[PDB]
């Protein structure tokens, strides 16, 4: 015979092991593969599709009112409209996104993000906004003077009703963590703020309150690693009719 000896780790069941096991149905012939549309071979394909931010995650915003930001005409210049917390791990506007849900199955992330904003007013509604990304280190900028010193895009409404704010990967090392400390130097992304660049000017027969829809995807330099369970689902009891599977 062959002289063998057992190592530490013999007989354990690691749930991430990669071995061959015994077939329970010998000479079983599976169903032939058919072409089905929309095959996913890597979860970073899904993460690059844009999906709606809930920037209006406030009380008195019920259901689908949370998916849009209402802007109106202002009588003061340079006013803040909204800001977006870039904290993906903690429960903010980015959590229930395709880039948000798939990343919460992972601990580390890297790469650029893109925010897309579609203006959903009338054709007669005109306006200019400035969408500012601020790298971390300070507070969230409240005035337009302070906010435009960072990464920004100035957007005129019109025939193309959308801009992209690329949020660049600006970090010390390669990855950031999904830490519960949002204020950590290895987890904080920064801030996105929106200001009136000029104003929303509408005529008398247009609706005086117009809406923005915010989207976010990831770019193709985006990366994820260190897979963990998601915080987005849980249970404390059994589901209904789960006892009927044993009866």
């Amino acid at each position: 015979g062959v002289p063998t000896y057992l190592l530490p780790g013999s007989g354990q069941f690691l749930t991430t092991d990669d071995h061959s096991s015994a077939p329970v149905l010998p000479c079983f012939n599976p169903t032939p593969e058919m072409h089905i549309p929309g095959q996913v071979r890597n979860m970073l394909e899904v993460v690059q599709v844009e999906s709606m931010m809930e920037i209006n995650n406030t009380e008195s915003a019920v259901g689908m009112e949370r998916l849009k930001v209402d802007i109106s005409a202002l009588t003061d210049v340079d006013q803040l409209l909204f800001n977006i917390p870039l904290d993906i791990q903690l429960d903010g506007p980015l959590r229930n996104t395709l880039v948000g849900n798939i990343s919460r199955y992972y601990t580390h992330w890297s790469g650029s993000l893109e925010m897309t904003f579609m203006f959903c007013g009338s054709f007669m509604a005109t306006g200019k906004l400035i969408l500012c990304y601020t790298p971390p280190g300070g507070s969230c900028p409240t005035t337009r003077e302070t906010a435009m010193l960072g990464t920004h895009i100035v957007w005129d409404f019109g025939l193309q009703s959308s801009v992209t704010l690329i949020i660049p990967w600006i970090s010390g090392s390669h990855y950031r963590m999904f830490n519960n400390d949002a204020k950590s130097t290895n987890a904080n992304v920064g801030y996105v703020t929106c200001f009136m660049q000029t104003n929303l000017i509408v005529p008398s027969e247009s609706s005086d309150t117009c809406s923005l829809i915010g989207f976010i995807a990831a770019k193709d330099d985006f990366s994820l690693r260190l897979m963990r369970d998601s915080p987005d689902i849980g249970q404390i009891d059994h589901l209904h009719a789960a006892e009927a599977a044993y009866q």
Partner: peptide, 29 residues
């Protein structure tokens, strides 16, 4: 894989083909 069935093998973790444009650019032009 000393088993005679091909589904008995270990997990196949070497499929690096992507096509994000079937979800990100599904438009015809």
């Amino acid at each position: 894989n000393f088993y005679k069935d091909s589904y008995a093998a270990s997990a196949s973790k070497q499929d690096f083909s992507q096509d994000p444009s079937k979800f990100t650019e599904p438009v015809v032009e």
